[PDB]
């Protein structure tokens, strides 16, 4: 178990080059101590010991030289070596490696073994001091033995004696007249004189080829005797490759059972199917049924049987089916291989059929068989994800990989999109001009990706958008229960036309381009992560607000992420904005490489036009999802981030996450540092709409608003202070000039706001002579160094401005060693008065006086606790009225002719968005505690924090645990609303009348929540989620290619243009059917131009001429891989045609099923070799694999390709299956060379890969460390 009980909550300190550990108590630690799972030791002075042994109790414990952690070592004790484990026990009969990477083996007495030894059946050598010889020869006994580099085990090896290679075996004896290897893995042959042989050699009646170096060449084809010869993969022995290796002659399969097992009918009646095609788990209606295994009786429509009882795609599958069903008690357990004769396999299928009919009679059911078939099917690579090339790079990380659907009118016309499906039309690639680069958008994200490039689908997205912005009017005839603005989810993963469609809709219906008051009545945001999206959005007129990741990113590097090494606060300034960082001169740099922060705040007087934006520190999807899961992983609750977790599992993890977040130590493993300081900056910045995350205010798990966070009071104060004081111009500075700090420099950031009409440091009074400014403005000081101590001389200054000369200021918020104090009003806080120039001066030590109460002492000291790791001071002017409001109302006048919607100014800055949900909330324990019920009772609270818009979670009904194939995502099983089946169901009752809330409550709860926010003068934001939809219940057959997030075919995939069963069709009787397209006709009549205006990506306008009441594949770009297999849709290998039964004039079935004679096997004729598949058809223009694993290609004429004498064996193949195109090497018996070198008629050597294709223009490596190069023309330079 444990040598010492663990301790937590104490910091490590370093004194005089040594680590000390100080307890939670504040006590220095001596002796052996398990601290946070690591066993460590401190001597009597309290210093930590590293790379030395210490004696505690009966244990001799070594501690590591880097970490000081207890680990195994060997100590020379008195005269002798003795091994020790991590717990300090002398080891017996065990290997141990010491500090220097040497290995000993200690015996029963603890004494190391010396000399030659056999251990666990391994021969090893030890030097006279007991050390293990590794990676060298050694003359023990008469003999000479080589010992392996890591194991130290005896192995054959070669060395160069004099000038000639010699071979040494495992026993240390030289090798004479035999094959022997070397450590690398090369085989040589050594003659009677000991000397290695070269070239072509015949020994023991067999011929081997040794190259110039003497290496035995296996799986090597070439013309050695002026006649072809292929050298074996097993032993390298030469075969003439004249003998055919296929073991299956042409045989007829028809017999007495064929007419009985044939299909009753060739159509959808007698065959289970998808769009006419058949699947591996298809059941069919045979003409007759061998009831009970005795008597054949005509079948009744309900007597369905599995196709795999009677037919198989190939012999391998047949043999596997037989072996699998056998193991389940259905007959003699059989070891069948593809090599087993076809007659034998078919006979064995029938004894299994008989047994099947017996267990059907015995059980009076077929469900046991459904489960047996289903299980067997998943076993086969062609019918599972093994042929789907699961990958996790990029967005594939979420669900394991994507399939892009194709326009294929010949095979899958229902699924044809009518030449739509333009992928990756993100803002920067809206016109496809970056399709060949990484600037093509990652169109595929999650689930079923909707084709937003299709005009018809674009119209439907507008219908949905109308439905949300009139939700209340339509669903409750309540014109006060309507959403006011939107958030556009996943901007970079959809067609950017949607932004224009949304923008123009808002223009038409609300005149958002007419005034700031109209625009700001419908606050709308974008989830737009690309670093070039801000500038796009601004070119297109800011119809929705861009995020400002530049500021969120800098919070990450300078405050929020990591215990120690953080970027300086200097980086917030982006001094590069000005030429030569001339803060003195302030000349703007007109021509920089598109870099830096979106809005400069060094001296922002409102004089330069800037891009309007929202900003945040954290989000429901930023710094939440990963930490919450890392916490679960760290405590063994789940293994992987994509792992499925239950709600209970989430709750347990959440308890650790909370413990870490509130940790008094001040260290955070999963959670973010300095959130209060980050909000202090977020909430005082000019030219932004800040957004506040629910999960920084309340705890992210459990019930909605169940418990506030420790940050709540500080952030609540900042929010109320923002209403009272935050207006006017801004400045921002740091006691720093770059990455590195000079002697006095603290790297403390100073951010100031001046008051309503005050735009600069030196401005003394407003132009309009308003006095509002005097009691407004704010001062913020922040640091990222919890070990910050000022020099005695040093002074830190807030330039509150020449509009605030001689004024008294009081603290709103001040940090200290146990927390951050919050001062709710002037009387309770320390005051400090500004000088003649308007500066508040601060020293290492300060003596502040309260306005009436007392004298206060306060040090400018970095602190470390749960609320901060650094410094935070905020100061406000005393004398602020109780109802003082510094905000600017938005003006109804047409201020701008620029065409733009949003404008960054004091009015827009007066808004605050509250993102009011967390993805990790628990499900409501009762209807009364549902989020939207709570929001209604609590609307008041947010009015007083200055929230002007409430961003509600997506209200769409969760797809839940439903999972038709593939990886489920956390959105779905956590019911957060981002994963949904029905876009229009926002919590309606079941059709039987029973309640059916979402995670957030019923549809009435939502309308009440929205109204309540309007009664308190707040807007409601709808989450618009056009990228995807989950768990569609209806199957269709699509043509699919395996693709990465950008829709580019994976480099090494056979999955190209294959038929696949996907879940793409909606129920048709859901709320998408009720409300789909219903509002478009009214909209076209009222606002024609929306439907006549051309969209950029398509050159076309949106098309409301077709309505979408039911989703189906034709409106989709693709899906995450569904784990069904590349050939779950059944196909004949010979002709490559897929089976179908939809229309009687174009039926294709295996011939057995139509009571015709199916012949199968290889048959020679005067012209060449032919092959017939199990379904009875001739192989033409296709690759075919025999029962022994050999591959062949059959040409257009139906003949196996084979090399002729004196002619080039390399052939260029062009097939119906395009992926297989390439240069192949076929032997005289037609076998394809794979994973090996092949000589042409002229002596040039080429290499052919795992699948037989020639490899060109690359270096190729070998298991024995041999390197070769292949030229562009294919030849091997080597």
List interacting residues with Ca ion (CB under 5 A). Answer: 443, 449, 493-494, 1027
Distance, CA of 950 to CA of 88 (rounded, Å): 61
Asked whether 219 and 1231 are in contact (CB, 8 A), the reply is no
Asked whether 199 and 172 are in contact (CB, 8 A), the reply is no
Asked whether 1202 and 1229 are in contact (CB, 8 A), the reply is yes
Shortest Cβ 448–Ca ion spacing (Å): 10
3-state class percentages of the chain: helix first, strand second, coil last, to nearest 5 = 20, 25, 55
Alpha helices in 662-711 (DSSP H): 675-682, 694-697
Shortest Cβ 1117–Ca ion spacing (Å): 6
Backbone angles phi, psi at 783, to 5 degrees: -135, 160
Helix (H) or strand (E) holding 397: helix 396-399
Residue among 494 and 717 whose Cβ is closer to Ca ion: 494
Query: Binding site for Ca(2+), residues?
Result: 443, 449, 493, 1027
Residue among 431 and 892 whose Cβ is closer to Ca ion: 431
Detail the DSSP E strand segments found in 744-850.
Answer: 749-753, 778-783, 795-799, 808-815, 820-822, 830-833, 839-843, 845-850
Residue among 735 and 1027 whose Cβ is closer to Ca ion: 1027
Shortest Cβ 429–Ca ion spacing (Å): 13
Asked whether 576 and 737 are in contact (CB, 8 A), the reply is no
Distance, CA of 399 to CA of 1043 (rounded, Å): 13
Distance, CA of 488 to CA of 466 (rounded, Å): 14
Please, what is the Cα angle at 528 between 527 and 530, to 5 degrees?
Answer: 150
Q: Per the structure block, which two tokens stand in for 476?
A: 């409750």
Residue among 449 and 687 whose Cβ is closer to Ca ion: 449
Residue among 452 and 1019 whose Cβ is closer to Ca ion: 452
CA distances from 1 to 57, 71, 83, 86 (A): 15, 15, 20, 12
Shortest Cβ 440–Ca ion spacing (Å): 12
Shortest Cβ 979–Ca ion spacing (Å): 14
Shortest Cβ 244–Ca ion spacing (Å): 51
Asked whether 921 and 931 are in contact (CB, 8 A), the reply is yes
Shortest Cβ 1027–Ca ion spacing (Å): 5
Residue among 494 and 906 whose Cβ is closer to Ca ion: 494
Neighbours of 341 (CB within 10 A): 16
Distance, CA of 565 to CA of 106 (rounded, Å): 45
Shortest Cβ 1089–Ca ion spacing (Å): 27
Q: Output b/e per residue, 86-124; b: 16+ Cβ within 10 A.
A: bebebbeeebbebeeeebbbbeeebebeeebeeeeeebb
Distance, CA of 710 to CA of 673 (rounded, Å): 13
Residue among 356 and 445 whose Cβ is closer to Ca ion: 445
Shortest Cβ 464–Ca ion spacing (Å): 16
Distance, CA of 1122 to CA of 399 (rounded, Å): 10
Contact residues for 990 (Cβ-Cβ < 8 A; gap 6+): 996
Of 1237, 1256, 1235, 1236, the closest CA to residue 1245 belongs to 1237
Helix (H) or strand (E) holding 1009: helix 1003-1015
Task: Map 859-919 to HEC letters.
Answer: ECECEEECCEEEEEEEEEECCCCCCCCCCCCCCCCCCCCCCCCCCCCHHHHCCCEEECCCC
Distance, CA of 251 to CA of 244 (rounded, Å): 17
Shortest Cβ 649–Ca ion spacing (Å): 30
Residue among 496 and 1104 whose Cβ is closer to Ca ion: 496
Kind of pairing between the strands at 1019-1024 and 949-951? parallel
Instruction: Calculate the CA 57 to chain-centre distance.
Output: 49
Distance, CA of 1262 to CA of 851 (rounded, Å): 83
Residue among 493 and 921 whose Cβ is closer to Ca ion: 493
Looking at residue 1152, the DSSP 8-state letter turns out to be: G
Helix (H) or strand (E) holding 466: helix 455-469
Shortest Cβ 449–Ca ion spacing (Å): 4
Residue among 425 and 601 whose Cβ is closer to Ca ion: 425
Distance, CA of 468 to CA of 20 (rounded, Å): 61
Shortest Cβ 453–Ca ion spacing (Å): 9
Shortest Cβ 394–Ca ion spacing (Å): 14
Residue among 422 and 724 whose Cβ is closer to Ca ion: 422
Distance, CA of 252 to CA of 342 (rounded, Å): 9
Residue among 493 and 930 whose Cβ is closer to Ca ion: 493
Phi-psi region of 769 (alpha: psi -120 to 50; beta: other; left: phi over 0): left
Query: Binding site, residues?
Result: 443, 449, 493, 1027
Shortest Cβ 1103–Ca ion spacing (Å): 19
Shortest Cβ 1099–Ca ion spacing (Å): 20
CA atoms lying within 13 Å on the CB side of residue 275: 23
Residue among 449 and 772 whose Cβ is closer to Ca ion: 449
Residue among 366 and 420 whose Cβ is closer to Ca ion: 420
Helix (H) or strand (E) holding 1021: strand 1019-1024
Residue among 452 and 863 whose Cβ is closer to Ca ion: 452
């Amino acid at each position: 178990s444990n040598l010492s009980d663990p301790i937590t909550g104490g910091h490590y300190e370093n004194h005089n080059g040594y680590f000390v550990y100080i307890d939670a108590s504040g006590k220095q630690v001596t002796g052996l101590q398990n601290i946070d799972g690591n066993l460590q030791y401190f001597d009597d002075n309290g210093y930590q010991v590293k790379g030395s042994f210490r004696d505690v109790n009966g244990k001799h414990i070594y501690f590591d030289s880097v970490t000081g952690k207890a680990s195994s070592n060997v100590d020379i004790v008195n005269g002798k070596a003795q091994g020790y484990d991590a717990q300090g026990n002398q080891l017996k009969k065990s290997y141990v490696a010491d500090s220097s990477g040497q290995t000993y083996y200690f015996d029963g007495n603890g004494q190391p073994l010396i000399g030659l030894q056999t251990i666990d059946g391994n021969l090893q050598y030890f030097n006279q001091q007991g050390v293990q010889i590794k990676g060298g020869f050694q003359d023990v006994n008469n003999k000479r033995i080589y010992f392996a580099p890591n194991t130290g085990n005896a192995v054959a090896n070669t060395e160069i004696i004099n000038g000639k290679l010699q071979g040494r075996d495992a026993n240390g004896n030289q090798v004479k007249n035999a094959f022997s290897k070397d450590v690398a893995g090369n085989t040589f042959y050594f003659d009677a004189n000991g000397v290695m042989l070269t070239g072509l050699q015949t020994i023991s009646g067999k011929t081997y080829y040794l190259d110039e170096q003497g290496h035995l060449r296996k799986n090597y084809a070439g013309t050695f005797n002026n006649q072809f010869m292929y050298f074996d993969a097993d032993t390298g022995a030469g075969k003439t490759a004249i003998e055919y290796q296929f073991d299956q002659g042409l045989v007829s399969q028809s017999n007495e059972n064929t007419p009985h097992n044939a299909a009753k009918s060739y159509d959808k009646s007698s065959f289970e199917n998808v769009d006419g095609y058949l699947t591996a788990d298809t059941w069919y209606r045979p003409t007759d049924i061998l009831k009970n295994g005795d008597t054949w009786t005509a079948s009744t429509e309900t007597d369905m049987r599995p196709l795999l009882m009677t037919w198989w795609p190939d012999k391998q599958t047949q043999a596997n089916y037989l072996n699998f069903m056998s193991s389940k008690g259905l007959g003699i357990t059989t070891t069948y291989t593809a090599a087993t004769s076809q007659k034998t396999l078919n006979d064995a299928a029938f004894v299994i059929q008989t047994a099947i009919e017996q267990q059907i009679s015995l059980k009076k059911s077929t469900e046991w068989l459904r489960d047996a078939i289903d299980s067997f099917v998943k076993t086969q690579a062609n019918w599972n994800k093994q042929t789907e090339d699961e990958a996790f790079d990029g967005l594939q990380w979420l669900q394991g990989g994507f399939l892009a659907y194709q326009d294929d009118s010949h095979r899958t016309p229902n699924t044809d999109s009518g030449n739509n499906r333009k992928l990756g039309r993100q803002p920067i690639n809206i016109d496809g001009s970056k399709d060949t680069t990484d600037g093509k958008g990652s169109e595929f994200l999650l689930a079923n990706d909707i084709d937003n490039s299709n005009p018809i689908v674009q119209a439907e997205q507008l219908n949905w958008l109308h439905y949300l912005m009139n939700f209340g009017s339509i669903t409750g005839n309540n014109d006060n229960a309507n959403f006011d603005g939107i958030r556009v989810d996943a901007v970079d993963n959809v067609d950017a036309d949607l932004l224009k469609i949304a923008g123009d809709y808002f223009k038409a219906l609300y005149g958002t381009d007419k005034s700031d008051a109209n625009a700001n009545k419908h606050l709308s945001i974008l989830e737009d992560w690309n670093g070039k999206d801000p500038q796009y959005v601004n070119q297109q007129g800011n119809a929705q607000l861009t995020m400002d990741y530049t500021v969120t990113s800098q919070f990450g590097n300078s405050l929020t992420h990591g215990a120690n090494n953080r970027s300086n606060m200097w980086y917030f300034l982006d001094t590069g904005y000005y030429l030569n960082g001339d803060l003195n001169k302030k000349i703007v740099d007109k021509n920089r490489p598109n870099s830096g922060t979106l809005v400069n705040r060094i001296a922002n007087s409102g004089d330069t036009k800037v891009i309007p934006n929202y900003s945040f520190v954290r989000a429901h999807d930023y710094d939440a999802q990963d930490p919450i899961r890392k916490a679960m992983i760290d405590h063994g609750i789940i293994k992987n981030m994509q792992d499925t977790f239950t709600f209970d599992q989430l709750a347990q993890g959440m308890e650790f996450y909370y413990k870490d977040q509130e940790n008094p130590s001040g260290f955070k493993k999963y959670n973010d540092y300095n959130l209060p300081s980050a909000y202090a900056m977020l909430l005082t910045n000019k030219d932004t709409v800040p957004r506040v995350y629910y999960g920084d205010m309340y705890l992210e798990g459990g019930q909605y608003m169940e418990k506030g966070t420790i940050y709540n009071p500080v952030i609540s104060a900042l929010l109320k202070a923002r209403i009272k004081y935050v207006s006017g111009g801004q400045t921002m500075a740091t006691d720093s000039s770059g990455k590195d700090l000079k002697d006095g420099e603290t790297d403390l950031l100073t951010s100031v706001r001046f008051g309503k009409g005050i735009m600069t440091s030196d401005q003394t009074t407003t132009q309009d002579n308003s006095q509002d400014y005097k009691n407004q403005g704010i001062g913020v000081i922040v640091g990222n160094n919890p070990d910050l101590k000022l020099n005695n001389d040093k002074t830190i200054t807030l330039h509150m401005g020449k509009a605030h000369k001689n004024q008294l200021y009081r603290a709103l918020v001040l940090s200290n060693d146990s927390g951050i104090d919050v001062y709710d009003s002037d009387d309770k806080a320390p005051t400090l008065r500004t000088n003649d120039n308007g500066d508040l001066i601060f020293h290492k030590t300060n003596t502040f006086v309260k306005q009436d109460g007392t004298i206060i002492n306060y040090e400018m000291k970095g602190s470390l606790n749960a609320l901060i790791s650094g410094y935070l001071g905020v100061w406000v002017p005393v004398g602020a009225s109780d109802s003082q409001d510094a905000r600017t109302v938005a003006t109804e006048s047409s201020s701008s002719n620029d065409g733009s919607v949003f404008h960054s100014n004091a009015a827009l800055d007066s808004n605050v968005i509250y993102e009011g949900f967390s993805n990790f909330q628990a499900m409501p324990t009762s209807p009364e505690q549902s989020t939207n019920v709570v929001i209604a009772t609590k609307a008041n609270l947010f009015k007083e924090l200055g929230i002007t818009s409430f961003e509600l979670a997506p209200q769409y009904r969760s797809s839940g645990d439903t999972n038709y194939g593939g990886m489920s995502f956390l959105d779905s099983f956590l019911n957060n609303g981002y994963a949904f089946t029905d876009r229009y169901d926002l919590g309606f009752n079941k059709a039987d009348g029973n309640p059916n809330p979402t995670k957030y409550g019923t549809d009435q709860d939502l309308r009440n929540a929205i109204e309540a926010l309007h009664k308190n003068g707040m807007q409601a934001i709808a989450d618009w989620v056009p990228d995807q939809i989950y768990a569609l219940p209806g199957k269709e057959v699509v043509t699919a290619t395996r693709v990465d997030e950008r829709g580019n075919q994976l480099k090494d995939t056979d999955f190209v243009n294959l038929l696949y069963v996907a879940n793409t069709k909606s129920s048709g009787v859901d709320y998408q059917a009720k409300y789909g397209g219903e509002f478009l006709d009214k909209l076209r009549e009222e606002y024609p131009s929306l439907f006549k205006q051309n969209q950029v990506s398509t050159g076309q306008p949106i098309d409301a001429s077709t309505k979408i009441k039911q989703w189906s594949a034709k409106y989709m770009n693709g899906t995450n891989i569904l784990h069904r297999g590349a050939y779950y849709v059944l196909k004949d290998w010979a002709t490559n045609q897929y089976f179908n039964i939809a229309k009687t004039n174009e039926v294709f079935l295996p011939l057995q099923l139509q009571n015709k004679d199916a012949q199968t096997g290889f048959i020679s004729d005067a012209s060449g070799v032919k092959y017939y598949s199990i379904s009875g058809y001739q192989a033409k223009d296709t690759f075919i694999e025999d029962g022994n694993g050999n591959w062949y290609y059959f040409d257009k004429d139906g003949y196996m390709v084979r090399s002729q004498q004196g002619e080039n064996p390399i052939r260029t193949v062009e097939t119906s299956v395009n992926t297989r195109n390439g240069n192949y090497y076929f032997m005289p018996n037609g076998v394809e060379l794979r994973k090996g070198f092949g000589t042409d008629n002229s002596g040039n050597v080429y290499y052919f890969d795992d699948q037989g294709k020639m490899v060109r223009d690359k270096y190729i490596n070998d298991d024995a460390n041999n390197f070769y190069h292949l030229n562009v023309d294919g030849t091997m330079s080597r």
